[PDB]
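Summary for the steering committee. One of the milestones for this cycle was to obtain a three-dimensional model of the protein with manganese (II) ion bound, which we needed before selecting residues for the alanine scan. The sequence and ligand used are listed below.
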Amino acid sequence: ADTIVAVELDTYPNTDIGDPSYPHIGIDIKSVRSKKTAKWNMQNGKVGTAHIIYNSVDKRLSAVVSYPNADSATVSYDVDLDNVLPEWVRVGLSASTGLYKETNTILSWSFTSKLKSNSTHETNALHFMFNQFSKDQKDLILQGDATTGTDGNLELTRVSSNGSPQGSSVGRALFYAPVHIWESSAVVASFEATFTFLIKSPDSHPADGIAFFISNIDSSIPSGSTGRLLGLFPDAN
Amino acid sequence: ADTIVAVELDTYPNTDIGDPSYPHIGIDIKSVRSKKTAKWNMQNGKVGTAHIIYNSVDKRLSAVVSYPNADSATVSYDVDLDNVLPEWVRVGLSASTGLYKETNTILSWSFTSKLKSNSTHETNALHFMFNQFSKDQKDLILQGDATTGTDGNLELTRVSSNGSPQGSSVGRALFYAPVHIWESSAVVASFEATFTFLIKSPDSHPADGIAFFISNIDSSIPSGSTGRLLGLFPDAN
Amino acid sequence: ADTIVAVELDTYPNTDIGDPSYPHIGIDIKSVRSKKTAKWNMQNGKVGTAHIIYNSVDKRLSAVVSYPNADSATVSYDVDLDNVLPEWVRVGLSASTGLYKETNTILSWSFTSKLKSNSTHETNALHFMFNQFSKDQKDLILQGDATTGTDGNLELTRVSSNGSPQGSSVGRALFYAPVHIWESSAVVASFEATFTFLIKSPDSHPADGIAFFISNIDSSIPSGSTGRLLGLFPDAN
Amino acid sequence: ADTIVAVELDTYPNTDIGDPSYPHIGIDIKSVRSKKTAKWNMQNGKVGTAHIIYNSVDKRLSAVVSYPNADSATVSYDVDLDNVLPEWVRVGLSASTGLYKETNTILSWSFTSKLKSNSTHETNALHFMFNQFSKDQKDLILQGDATTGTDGNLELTRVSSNGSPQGSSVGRALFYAPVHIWESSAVVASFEATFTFLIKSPDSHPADGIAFFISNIDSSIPSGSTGRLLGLFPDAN
Ligand SMILES: O=[N+]([O-])c1ccc(O[C@H]2O[C@H](CO)[C@@H](O)[C@H](O)[C@H]2O)cc1
Ligand SMILES: O=[N+]([O-])c1ccc(O[C@H]2O[C@H](CO)[C@@H](O)[C@H](O)[C@H]2O)cc1
Ligand SMILES: O=[N+]([O-])c1ccc(O[C@H]2O[C@H](CO)[C@@H](O)[C@H](O)[C@H]2O)cc1
Ligand SMILES: O=[N+]([O-])c1ccc(O[C@H]2O[C@H](CO)[C@@H](O)[C@H](O)[C@H]2O)cc1
Ligand SMILES: [Ca+2]
Ligand SMILES: [Ca+2]
Ligand SMILES: [Ca+2]
Ligand SMILES: [Ca+2]
Ligand SMILES: [Mn+2]
Ligand SMILES: [Mn+2]
Ligand SMILES: [Mn+2]
Ligand SMILES: [Mn+2]
């Protein structure tokens, strides 16, 4: 099994699995059934930005999603990641379409991991930032239908020349280098991530959503995880 | 007097005003009667470190103090600075003594403050990092008995030529340029400071402590803010 | 008088004082008479980016001005800045108009000074970055006609409500906190600034220029510096 | 074979292959016979720090080695890396011993690279810093005798239980994720590296040196590259 911690930008409400009756953002801890969600006003065609922050001091994961001139959705969950994650992990973005479809384009992405110790002045860290992706983005592990290059953007799910988004698609893109998310001697551990997304659909309701996840190094897309499972979890439990 | 928000490293328990019967950590908002406290196994003679963090997402101010190969004190508090501070401020370090003394020596200090806008790539930030203080540190506003140069350190309170601390002393150090702590359009607003220190004393009980405060641009040690008032508040009311 | 070092984005050619027969970029080591220049193909109305860098290992000052969809004009000179500037200085922007005029709008400004001492890795550093300029910017010393808050940009020179520039104008913008540009116990000294400008002129003869400058803490607009002197020098010597 | 561009801290004078009569810092381009060098007052048994720097503006590679309060060696060379290195590479350290020995301890390492493209306000960048090497450092490709964890340091070559160094050893350490060292659209490409070391030989005649190299993704220790070849080049041709 895989250990998954993630913030989901869910566009399609699957009321049957406890989804709110509207698009939303939520914190997923080892399950597709969000521990805490927040109403989100999905804007079709408009480029949204999403900022996620976390630190072991207050032990609280938070996510803010905003569109220029428009409001912002926020959500926070009290979680001690050191109990719910391997010491080493791999960070990345996931997205998927199902019966309904949408474009899950990632215009940019940046991440910052920071491990401060008890020993004065000793600190380990990692940070990367992409403002444009290359066809051969040699530092991202592409998985599924994820492809880089087109217009310098990262397409997490299948699209066509018409610009049309294909249904039943699923893709993931995660940074090559393993992230050292925590440790015992660390007095303060905290990570921060930011990405800009572009989502638009031709049909009545877009689906299914983009998500930022943290997982163990060898994580591979679970069998039949398109649609409601956002390409992250193997079952809707 | 004016507005002050601070995290205090209180080494001497002043019961009459609210100090618990032990050296502690605490969040101070517009008053010297802490909103939150946490025991702190003060290590006399040792070099300690402190980390202060805040962000408008979850909206909590928290601090952590540690010593190499030892425990770590922690304290957080819910506070929306938007309702407690002027949009523009100055940040600094304070210290003091009275009947009993101690050395409030700061070995290094750093600070970072960012303002993430609602519009993509609109981020305003400021960050300085003092790892070595000089005889004429032109970018700091030294107040009270604060001096620079001694071993490249920053002495907040008076120290005798041989090194011995001196009672009834009050000093301060404010970075020169004003900091734009918050803004109404900012989607995310945060800051974080860090400093290593040395609190050494001869007598049975060191006093009074060290503190990181944030106040309005124009600010100086309030009349009579010696000892238990840490040089931050004009009174204990 | 004031000790100045500047990178000049010269739009109007003042052949009479050494200006090449075409708009250009040049390095000024204490005189308006550039120590070296390179042809700059201006792009009236296009937002461009300026990149300036320097380190004490090479003693070479370098600048690069580029536009989207076009080649860039690079320029570099060997100048031991510690043998020209004080240990502490002030960084800022300057712009002026003469008979003919233009808009010297600054969209964003960023700067970073890193002074790495000789001790292990005890580094000192300052970094500010603006991507949005507020109406009352308590951290910027405005001089001359320089205004802010206009579209969240910085207006170095004069402009009328209808976005029409004015002539015989001069304005400067200086960062508040002094900058310790050089130490003598540091193994490596380095700095860099980047700004994005928007120059639009109606009279088919844009004048006069923009310039990044480093000066003495108390620097100020010289008299009659408007026009060909870019509000930086008192004469064309 | 592999394409190597390295900065060598050559402790042993192999006159037979161009090494000066004294220890030195040299710049190696697709060869072990340095293009340029400089005398190095190697201080047997004391922590030192090397600092590499390079940028595309003035296309120059420089290095500075220094021990606390002592001689500061320096060496530079003009080289357009984009015409020598693959658009994608890997970075890492390397050290070795032969008939003579020495401890090749790295106590910390940091790297940072940025790519400012023609695209206004859009950058790409990678930065990592290690102040402590974990027993199981999952983001480094240890080759040869390279081992981390011991004393929280990183041992590039063989070191006996009693601490004594061993002869005829070679080790490497390359960061896991590939580094997009350059790209056409980039108006300004530039990296920076910084690392502290502790070379000590229990006598007076040490050898053979350490080196910071940039190589093609799949570089492996050449056969017989011990000692004078520093585990970087297949032949001292
Ligand atoms: O509107 N409907 O009646 C309706 C249509 C489809 C539906 O589920 C299907 O499509 C979703 C959207 O792609 C997926 O999340 C889900 O995995 C898949 O089973 C549920 C209800
Ligand atoms: O021993 N005692 O009982 C005793 C000693 C001192 C005392 O207060 C005095 O010294 C403190 C420590 O310097 C200050 O915080 C305080 O402002 C000042 O009034 C109170 C009681
Ligand atoms: O027609 N002309 O040949 C002619 C006209 C004006 C002129 O100078 C005046 O206007 C310039 C552009 O605003 C300034 O650079 C200069 O400082 C100012 O004195 C020079 C030549
Ligand atoms: O006795 N000596 O002084 C003496 C010692 C060693 C020597 O060369 C040998 O050892 C070097 C140092 O390990 C290697 O770099 C070199 O590859 C190998 O041939 C030459 C003379
Ligand atoms: Ca759903
Ligand atoms: Ca007290
Ligand atoms: Ca001119
Ligand atoms: Ca040699
Ligand atoms: Mn959901
Ligand atoms: Mn107290
Ligand atoms: Mn000129
Ligand atoms: Mn050599």
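Key point for the committee: Chains A and C do not touch (no CB pair under 8 Å).
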